[PDB]
Amino acid sequence: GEFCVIPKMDGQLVEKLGQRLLPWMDRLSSEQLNPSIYVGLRLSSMQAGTKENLYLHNLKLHYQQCLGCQTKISGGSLALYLLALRANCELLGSRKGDRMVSQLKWFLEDEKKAIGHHHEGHPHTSYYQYGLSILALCVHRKRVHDSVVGKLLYAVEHDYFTYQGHLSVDTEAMAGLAFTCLERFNFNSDLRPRITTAIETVREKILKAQAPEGYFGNIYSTPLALQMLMTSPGVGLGPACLKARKSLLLSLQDGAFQNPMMISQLLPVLNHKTYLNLISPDCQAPRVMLVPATEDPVHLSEVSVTLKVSSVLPPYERTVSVFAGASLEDVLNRARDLGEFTYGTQASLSGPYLTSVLGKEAGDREYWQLLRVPDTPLLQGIADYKPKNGETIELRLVKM
Ligand code: B12
Numbered sequence: 001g002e003f004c005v006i007p008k009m010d011g012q013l014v015e016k017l018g019q020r021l022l023p024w025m026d027r028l029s030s031e032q033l034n035p036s037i038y039v040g041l042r043l044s045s046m047q048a049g050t051k052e053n054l055y056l057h058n059l060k061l062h063y064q065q066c067l068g069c070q071t072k073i074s075g076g077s078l079a080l081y082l083l084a085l086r087a088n089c090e091l092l093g094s095r096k097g098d099r100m101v102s103q104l105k106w107f108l109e110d111e112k113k114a115i116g117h118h119h120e121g122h123p124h125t126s127y128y129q130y131g132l133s134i135l136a137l138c139v140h141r142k143r144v145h146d147s148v149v150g151k152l153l154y155a156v157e158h159d160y161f162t163y164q165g166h167l168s169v170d171t172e173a174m175a176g177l178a179f180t181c182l183e184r185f186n187f188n189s190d191l192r193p194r195i196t197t198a199i200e201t202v203r204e205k206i207l208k209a210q211a212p213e214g215y216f217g218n219i220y221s222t223p224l225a226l227q228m229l230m231t232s233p234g235v236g237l238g239p240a241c242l243k244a245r246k247s248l249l250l251s252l253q254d255g256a257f258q259n260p261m262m263i264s265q266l267l268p269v270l271n272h273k274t275y276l277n278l279i280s281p282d283c284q285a286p287r288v289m290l291v292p293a294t295e296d297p298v299h300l301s302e303v304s305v306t307l308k309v310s311s312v313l314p315p316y317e318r319t320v321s322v323f324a325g326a327s328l329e330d331v332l333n334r335a336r337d338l339g340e341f342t343y344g345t346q347a348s349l350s351g352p353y354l355t356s357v358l359g360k361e362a363g364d365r366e367y368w369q370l371l372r373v374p375d376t377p378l379l380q381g382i383a384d385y386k387p388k389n390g391e392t393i394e395l396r397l398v399k400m
Pocket residue numbers: 074075076077080124125126128129164165166168170171218219220221222224259262265348349350351352353354355367368369370371377378379380381382384400
């Protein structure tokens with residue numbers, strides 16, 4: 001009863017999850033490649049055959065060219081690439097110095113300097129990318145200076161991620177995964193007392209974030225939370241993870257996990273694997289070939305949705321009709337079709353990220369928050385959220 005397991009998952013719901021990723025395997029441009037998709041598939045019970053090798057080949061070309069390149073690569077994006085390499089049993093820099101290892105180490109040094117000596121500053125990216133980058137170096141058997149690790153320990157020790165925009169456990173779980181890797185290598189040994197305590201702290205916070213329905217924080221934090229719990233057994237994990245199983249099953253029946261990044265975080269845990277398996281991974285794992293799904297019928301049913309923006313002058317409010325199952329992005333496009341509404345996005349590994357509305361671009365340390373009136377942050381982005389009839393969705397420019 002001490003191991004976190006997810007037994008008896010519906011086989012078809014899982015198959016459909018993998019089928020949703022399969023067509024993304026053909027989206028090979030620098031503008032759409034996502035190393036997390038490759039990782040998630042390799043750690044899953046499913047495979048895409050030779051499409052995987054072509055995906056990895058294109059990942060290598062993209063991340064090597066952007067050391068030609070069109071968009072700059074964040075530290076955490078490089079870290080996910082390092083995870084993809086481990087998923088193919090490849091190791092960087094075991095015999096010579098490696099540019100990518102150095103680039104990622106310097107990203108962390110830059111973020112450490114941004115945080116500052118009194119933890120009075122903030123990362124230029126996020127503590128999520130900070131922890132992800134420590135983890136990715138660690139699975140390649142690369143250590144970082146104690147001073148880098150100390151900043152993440154301090155944030156866990158002082159409940160730092162609560163202030164930040166998101167209030168769930170994704171960042172804490174990622175930090176725990178990083179710490180778990182450090183512990184297994186006995187890296188940063190002077191910090192070992194802090195590291196081992198922080199692992200317990202993170203596990204305890206995850207368990208306390210469990211809702212009666214069974215998810216940890218929210219349904220989309222639940223994959224990384226489950227990874228952290230799956231790294232090691234403990235009292236109560238069996239029952240806690242069985243509750244999470246029920247939450248995941250119901251969410252899948254309700255249409256959750258259509259987003260590729262989210263699918264890629266869920267697939268490993270459904271196969272009882274985590275990013276810690278990338279220290280010593282099976283590259284001969286048993287995995288069933290995916291086949292394309294058949295398209296669902298077209299619909300003429302409609303939903304009425306009100307779009308509201310109070311962060312601009314004059315404010316904006318318009319009720320539009322879109323087809324049922326249309327996305328929030330479709331609602332924005334309909335509003336733009338009908339009048340002077342405008343919006344802008346930028347690409348991310350999670351899909352389109354909203355960056356400007358009605359001519360107002362988010363500044364540094366600002367973002368456009370998506371809310372269901374009154375004041376309930378959405379759990380999905382514009383391309384994936386499917387508004388319900390009679391809802392009002394607000395776009396609000398907030399401070400990070
Ligand atoms: C950091 C972060 C943020 C930061 C990003 C800014 C920063 N300083 O980096 C802030 C707080 C601003 C943020 C905002 C949002 N986020 Co957020 N975020 C994360 C987090 C913790 C890590 C992402 C990351 O760095 N990944 C690694 C890097 C390498 O990947 P990347 O794609 O290059 O990272 C970028 C994108 O993640 C993007 N971004 C962040 N969140 C989201 C969400 C969506 C749907 C999209 C398209 C983009 C996006 O910002 C990152 C930096 O540029 C994840 C947790 C997770 N489990 O993945 C949640 C997560 C991705 N976010 C989520 C959500 C829902 C949102 C919001 C829609 C919340 C809201 N209601 O407004 C908004 C985005 C709205 C918009 N403007 O498009 C969900 C998405 C779930 C899903 N079904 O896809 C996650 C999984 C958290 C959760 N468990 O609920 N987020």
